[PDB]
Scaffold this active site. Structure first.
Site, PDB file in Angstrom:
ATOM      1  N   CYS B 108     -10.710  -3.276   2.469  1.00 21.41           N
ATOM      2  CA  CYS B 108      -9.724  -3.702   3.456  1.00 21.41           C
ATOM      3  C   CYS B 108     -10.047  -5.148   3.779  1.00 21.41           C
ATOM      4  O   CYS B 108     -11.149  -5.444   4.248  1.00 21.41           O
ATOM      5  CB  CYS B 108      -9.746  -2.833   4.731  1.00 21.41           C
ATOM      6  N   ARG B 111     -10.137  -6.514   8.050  1.00 26.87           N
ATOM      7  CA  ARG B 111     -11.124  -5.969   8.972  1.00 26.87           C
ATOM      8  C   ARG B 111     -11.480  -6.901  10.107  1.00 26.87           C
ATOM      9  O   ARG B 111     -12.182  -6.467  11.023  1.00 26.87           O
ATOM     10  CB  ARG B 111     -12.392  -5.588   8.218  1.00 26.87           C
ATOM     11  N   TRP B 280      -0.607  -3.797   9.594  1.00 26.14           N
ATOM     12  CA  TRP B 280       0.580  -4.490   9.122  1.00 26.14           C
ATOM     13  C   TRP B 280       0.338  -4.989   7.697  1.00 26.14           C
ATOM     14  O   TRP B 280      -0.784  -4.996   7.200  1.00 26.14           O
ATOM     15  CB  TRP B 280       0.966  -5.623  10.075  1.00 26.14           C
ATOM     16  N   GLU B 285       1.069  -7.300  -0.964  1.00 27.00           N
ATOM     17  CA  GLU B 285       1.201  -5.878  -1.303  1.00 27.00           C
ATOM     18  C   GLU B 285       2.641  -5.546  -1.615  1.00 27.00           C
ATOM     19  O   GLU B 285       2.931  -4.804  -2.562  1.00 27.00           O
ATOM     20  CB  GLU B 285       0.703  -4.977  -0.182  1.00 27.00           C
TER      21      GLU B 285
HETATM   22  C1  HEM Z   1      -3.845  -4.767  10.575  1.00 23.46           C
HETATM   23  C2  HEM Z   1      -3.864  -5.402   9.403  1.00 23.46           C
HETATM   24  C3  HEM Z   1      -4.376  -4.785   8.079  1.00 23.46           C
HETATM   25  C4  HEM Z   1      -4.262  -5.429   6.927  1.00 23.46           C
HETATM   26  C5  HEM Z   1      -3.612  -6.832   6.808  1.00 23.46           C
HETATM   27  C6  HEM Z   1      -4.821  -4.606   5.869  1.00 23.46           C
HETATM   28  C7  HEM Z   1      -4.886  -4.926   4.530  1.00 23.46           C
HETATM   29  C8  HEM Z   1      -5.312  -4.125   3.484  1.00 23.46           C
HETATM   30  C9  HEM Z   1      -5.050  -4.333   2.067  1.00 23.46           C
HETATM   31  C10 HEM Z   1      -4.216  -5.538   1.559  1.00 23.46           C
HETATM   32  C11 HEM Z   1      -5.651  -3.336   1.377  1.00 23.46           C
HETATM   33  C12 HEM Z   1      -5.697  -3.023  -0.137  1.00 23.46           C
HETATM   34  C13 HEM Z   1      -5.489  -4.170  -1.119  1.00 23.46           C
HETATM   35  C14 HEM Z   1      -4.395  -3.761  -2.071  1.00 23.46           C
HETATM   36  O1  HEM Z   1      -4.364  -2.563  -2.476  1.00 23.46           O
HETATM   37  O2  HEM Z   1      -3.531  -4.621  -2.406  1.00 23.46           O
HETATM   38  C15 HEM Z   1      -6.299  -2.471   2.357  1.00 23.46           C
HETATM   39  C16 HEM Z   1      -7.025  -1.329   2.120  1.00 23.46           C
HETATM   40  C17 HEM Z   1      -7.549  -0.475   3.093  1.00 23.46           C
HETATM   41  N1  HEM Z   1      -7.480  -0.606   4.466  1.00 23.46           N
HETATM   42 FE1  HEM Z   1      -6.636  -2.217   5.487  1.00 23.46          FE
HETATM   43  N2  HEM Z   1      -5.276  -3.443   6.459  1.00 23.46           N
HETATM   44  C18 HEM Z   1      -5.028  -3.511   7.809  1.00 23.46           C
HETATM   45  C19 HEM Z   1      -5.349  -2.524   8.707  1.00 23.46           C
HETATM   46  C20 HEM Z   1      -6.136  -1.415   8.454  1.00 23.46           C
HETATM   47  C21 HEM Z   1      -6.424  -0.340   9.378  1.00 23.46           C
HETATM   48  C22 HEM Z   1      -5.855  -0.266  10.816  1.00 23.46           C
HETATM   49  C23 HEM Z   1      -7.208   0.556   8.747  1.00 23.46           C
HETATM   50  C24 HEM Z   1      -7.810   1.872   9.295  1.00 23.46           C
HETATM   51  C25 HEM Z   1      -8.146   2.019  10.577  1.00 23.46           C
HETATM   52  C26 HEM Z   1      -7.463   0.061   7.409  1.00 23.46           C
HETATM   53  C27 HEM Z   1      -8.238   0.664   6.433  1.00 23.46           C
HETATM   54  C28 HEM Z   1      -8.119   0.449   5.074  1.00 23.46           C
HETATM   55  C29 HEM Z   1      -8.629   1.273   4.012  1.00 23.46           C
HETATM   56  C30 HEM Z   1      -9.432   2.558   4.181  1.00 23.46           C
HETATM   57  C31 HEM Z   1      -8.291   0.730   2.849  1.00 23.46           C
HETATM   58  C32 HEM Z   1      -8.636   1.272   1.460  1.00 23.46           C
HETATM   59  C33 HEM Z   1      -7.504   2.181   1.017  1.00 23.46           C
HETATM   60  C34 HEM Z   1      -7.938   2.742  -0.306  1.00 23.46           C
HETATM   61  O3  HEM Z   1      -9.185   2.785  -0.544  1.00 23.46           O
HETATM   62  O4  HEM Z   1      -7.053   3.137  -1.115  1.00 23.46           O
HETATM   63  N3  HEM Z   1      -6.792  -1.146   7.281  1.00 23.46           N
HETATM   64  N4  HEM Z   1      -6.078  -2.986   3.608  1.00 23.46           N
HETATM   65  C1  LIG Z   2      -3.861   1.869  -8.163  1.00 24.69           C
HETATM   66  N1  LIG Z   2      -4.152   0.976  -7.026  1.00 24.69           N
HETATM   67  C2  LIG Z   2      -2.910   0.381  -6.467  1.00 24.69           C
HETATM   68  C3  LIG Z   2      -2.940   0.357  -4.987  1.00 24.69           C
HETATM   69  C4  LIG Z   2      -3.027   0.492  -3.812  1.00 24.69           C
HETATM   70  C5  LIG Z   2      -3.070   0.895  -2.586  1.00 24.69           C
HETATM   71  C6  LIG Z   2      -3.699   2.124  -2.430  1.00 24.69           C
HETATM   72  C7  LIG Z   2      -3.823   2.729  -1.192  1.00 24.69           C
HETATM   73  F1  LIG Z   2      -4.454   3.916  -1.109  1.00 24.69           F
HETATM   74  C8  LIG Z   2      -3.305   2.099  -0.067  1.00 24.69           C
HETATM   75  C9  LIG Z   2      -2.656   0.877  -0.203  1.00 24.69           C
HETATM   76  C10 LIG Z   2      -2.124   0.245   1.066  1.00 24.69           C
HETATM   77  C11 LIG Z   2      -3.344  -0.009   1.930  1.00 24.69           C
HETATM   78  C12 LIG Z   2      -3.026  -0.629   3.271  1.00 24.69           C
HETATM   79  C13 LIG Z   2      -3.237   0.127   4.434  1.00 24.69           C
HETATM   80  C14 LIG Z   2      -2.979  -0.413   5.690  1.00 24.69           C
HETATM   81  C15 LIG Z   2      -3.186   0.396   6.954  1.00 24.69           C
HETATM   82  C16 LIG Z   2      -2.514  -1.718   5.759  1.00 24.69           C
HETATM   83  C17 LIG Z   2      -2.315  -2.442   4.581  1.00 24.69           C
HETATM   84  N2  LIG Z   2      -1.868  -3.704   4.682  1.00 24.69           N
HETATM   85  N3  LIG Z   2      -2.553  -1.896   3.362  1.00 24.69           N
HETATM   86  C18 LIG Z   2      -2.539   0.255  -1.462  1.00 24.69           C
HETATM   87 CL   LIG Z   3       2.161  -0.027   0.224  1.00 27.71          CL
END
Ligand code: HEM
Ligand SMILES: CNCC#Cc1cc(F)cc(CCc2cc(C)cc(N)n2)c1
Ligand SMILES: [Cl-]
Ligand code: HEM
Ligand SMILES: CNCC#Cc1cc(F)cc(CCc2cc(C)cc(N)n2)c1
Ligand SMILES: C[C@H](O)[C@H](O)[C@H]1CNc2nc(N)[nH]c(=O)c2N1
Ligand SMILES: C[C@H](O)[C@H](O)[C@H]1CNc2nc(N)[nH]c(=O)c2N1
Ligand SMILES: [Cl-]
Ligand SMILES: [Gd]
Ligand SMILES: [Gd]
Ligand SMILES: [Zn+2]
Ligand SMILES: [Zn+2]
Lengths: 404, 404
Positions: B108, B111, B280, B285
């Protein structure tokens, strides 16, 4: 056997070669350091086993593993080490090791070419002006009026006791790095340190932004002495843009030969500290890393002003727009000058083709994802959605400390 | 004994001492690295030491480590696992634990914001009908008329006796993907399977490219029930380009709220298989992944074609040019509609500040380079040149198998 998936097509393969060699890398069950550039940091009883292994697959690769010279070449080697302590490689072993190291380089994206490699044997070397002519033949052969050809020249293997052959430049062709009244630089800041040691050994400096540095060459023990490169030999491409008339006036050039001259070739348990290899460039290396990086030429905002881009907010994507055009000018300029160059799409598609080839041939292929995916437009290229396994096979090119 | 991590843009050096207490082990070994794999994986006494570790964590953060209140809570927890095999988090412990799980999420880039998380406690939830309305209220609070807020709703923990609450949908808002006469897909191909499910669970499908899917919600030991999201709860954004006015004729849209709903939240040994969370979007993405991935909406060629780019050859860098403008349109559309959004330059920049905050506080920061670095324009951002240690701390969001 790791399940390697491709997220774009859905294909599944298994990397069975990941098990077949070791030389332990950096990651552990409790943390992966795959994103690190150097894996941490940098009586001959089993120089034999490294040579046992190399020769064993050398014969595997020509069928004739099993009897004849195979079970015979095992003896000349063990005999040689018995009374010498080192050994000499048969000239074809040297060629075969030279190409296997390329085939094994996890960070290289151009390995679809691995089987067209010109190998200049130069182990008969022992002098500075000597090496310099071996280098200078390489450069002329590789450059070839701008129809580039992969090439490596192999200099004598470091022997037990008594010095090593070493090139003090990171590449054969490097540009100047001049500090000043700012602690800032005109020229290339990656090379600021070697410009230190160039002048410290008699180099008279120059103008500024694009001065082709002089080779610093050293033969065992005797220290390093400088060498100048004929401007008739360093082929270079002036950068222009097909539709933005002002780009040429920025006065940007880049050289044509990417030849890295500071890595250590390991074949069959011998270490060759001088072994410059040479290929041709992928466009992004010049346009995106060399010119656009903040700690290199950092031209990005200058090109953006000229394009009239809104530099007042990051959400205009002004950095992205200008980076693409810088890349377009690089491909365009090299194509006008008829200099071999490959774009990151073409390159990555060929690596995908390589991965399939290696799949049937060796059941896998070591690859470093963070170096295989291009530094711009990554997700747009087929290697982004392709999972990758990274391990260390021999023969291989390794990093080595600098002579200070 | 700790990894040296270098920033290459700047030459910063620190050592990641936090990686030492990595509370679980991952997919890499010294023999080979698997960091680019998407899915690496795929009693009362360890539940005791896990829970023990969280309580210690929780009490350090309130700067009351090793007090009576601290030894009371430890002695309480084991007393309750003795009696029941489980324990119950106090509300404050639950808020901290949801924050830390975000803080620890190595993939993420958002963070920097981890402390400002709105935690809705839904542990007293009872029905799949109650479940729906806790979610609707989540969507409503987080959407907030475009001024997005980060939020998580925690449904009741996994426990012996009854089954799990589960949200079947990968995200709270997703578009349907319909197979076709052409064997093709209409709509989002990432959601063909969940779409197959909804239909056979009674949902009467549409035939658009942007049909919002209903929620399949699972109360313990019941089959999943279908629930339609109220249209006026799902804020959507029509995509327009600020200077390519034919763009709006493509019909393209995306939704405001990314709410991940199929991950397991783990706190002090206890497992919350239903704990959807939302933040958000980062523009890449939507623009690069969701719209340009060839296995997703795959608009790249049709945009490039309309742009009158030269599609016959890749050296024109048409893919990169179309991609950049698709992103510009997303940032523009979302800012026009007053819906929160962050571009990859701002996002990676604040993530570098997070890395610096996190090194001063915990002595390190777990991070997955291949996910932190944006899918376009990587080296233009400051995270590209930053080495990163990847590892797994608890509390944590984990993947879990699909309940069907
Ligand atoms: C508020 C602004 C936030 C932004 C801008 C953001 C952005 C992102 C992005 C861009 C990715 C994945 C990169 C991609 O796949 O392209 C990601 C993954 C992730 N985010 Fe965030 N996020 C936000 C909030 C949060 C919140 C509120 C949580 C949980 C409380 C969180 C937890 C996670 C987790 C667990 C992943 C990994 C998902 C996975 O492993 O498939 N994020 N985030
Ligand atoms: C094969 N891999 C492609 C991909 C991917 C992807 C996977 C996921 F499990 C979640 C998100 C979106 C994650 C996310 C979550 C939140 C809360 C915010 C944000 N901006 N992006 C993207
Ligand atoms: Cl998405
Ligand atoms: C002919 C076409 C070639 C292309 C397009 C190519 C391209 C590349 C690129 C793009 C990288 C790393 C990304 C970067 O640093 O920007 C790389 C790394 C590397 N390549 Fe290739 N190369 C070619 C030929 C060769 C040859 C002939 C050899 C050796 C025989 C070789 C050996 C290596 C090695 C050792 C690295 C790792 C560099 C390091 O770790 O610092 N390459 N190559
Ligand atoms: C800190 N990391 C920065 C760096 C670096 C680097 C150094 C080098 F000496 C060569 C290359 C590019 C390597 C290369 C080699 C060949 C044969 C071809 C090619 N296109 N690129 C990159
Ligand atoms: C195979 C590949 O490692 C995988 O698809 C990942 C790589 N890194 C990524 N990084 C981001 N930001 N988004 C992604 O979808 C992915 N995909
Ligand atoms: C920190 C990061 O892993 C490191 O800078 C790598 C990443 N990717 C790269 N990609 C290219 N093409 N060249 C590089 O030097 C690097 N460096
Ligand atoms: Cl270079
Ligand atoms: Gd002008
Ligand atoms: Gd227009
Ligand atoms: Zn690893
Ligand atoms: Zn993608």
């Amino acid at each position: 056997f790791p399940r390697v998936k491709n997220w774009e097509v859905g294909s599944i393969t298994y990397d069975t070669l990941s098990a077949q060699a070791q030389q332990d890398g950096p990651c552990t069950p409790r943390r992966c350091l795959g994103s690190l550039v150097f894996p941490r940091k940098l009586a001959p009883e089993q120089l034999l086993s490294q040579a046992r292994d190399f020769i064993n697959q050398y014969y595997s690769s020509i069928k004739r593993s099993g009897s004849q010279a195979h079970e015979q070449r095992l003896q000349e080697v063990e005999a040689e080490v018995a009374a010498t302590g080192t050994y000499q490689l048969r000239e074809s072993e040297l060629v075969f090791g030279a190409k296997q190291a390329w085939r094994n380089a996890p960070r290289c994206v151009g390995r679809i070419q691995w089987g067209k490699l010109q190998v200049f044997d130069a182990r008969d070397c022992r002098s500075a002006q000597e090496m310099f002519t071996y280098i200078c033949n390489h450069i002329k052969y590789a450059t070839n009026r701008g129809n580039l050809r992969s090439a490596i020249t192999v200099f004598p293997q470091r022997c037990p006791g008594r010095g090593d052959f070493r090139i003090w430049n990171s590449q054969l062709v490097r540009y100047a790095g001049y500090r000043q009244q700012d602690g800032s630089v005109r020229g290339d800041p990656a090379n600021v340190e070697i410009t230190e040691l160039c002048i410290q050994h008699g180099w008279t400096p120059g103008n500024g932004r694009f001065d082709v540095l002089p080779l610093l060459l050293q033969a065992p023990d005797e220290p390093p002495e400088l060498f100048l490169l004929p401007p008739e030999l360093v082929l270079e491409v002036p950068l222009e843009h097909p539709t933005l008339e002002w780009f040429a006036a920025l006065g940007l050039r880049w050289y044509a030969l990417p030849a890295v001259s500071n890595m250590l070739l390991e074949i069959g348990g011998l270490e060759f500290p001088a072994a410059p290899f040479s290929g041709w460039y992928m466009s992004t290396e010049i346009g995106t890393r060399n010119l656009c990086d903040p700690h290199r030429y950092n031209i990005l905002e200058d090109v953006a002003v000229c394009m009239d881009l809104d530099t007042r907010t990051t959400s205009s994507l002004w950095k992205d727009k200008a980076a693409v055009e810088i890349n377009v000018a690089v491909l365009h300029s090299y194509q006008l000058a008829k200099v071999t160059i490959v774009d990151h799409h073409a390159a990555t598609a060929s690596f995908m083709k390589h991965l399939e080839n290696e799949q049937k041939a060796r059941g896998g292929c070591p690859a470093d994802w963070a170096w295989i995916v291009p530094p711009i437009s990554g997700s747009l290229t087929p290697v982004f959605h392709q999972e990758m396994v990274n391990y260390f096979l021999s023969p291989a090119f390794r990093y080595q400390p600098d002579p200070w």
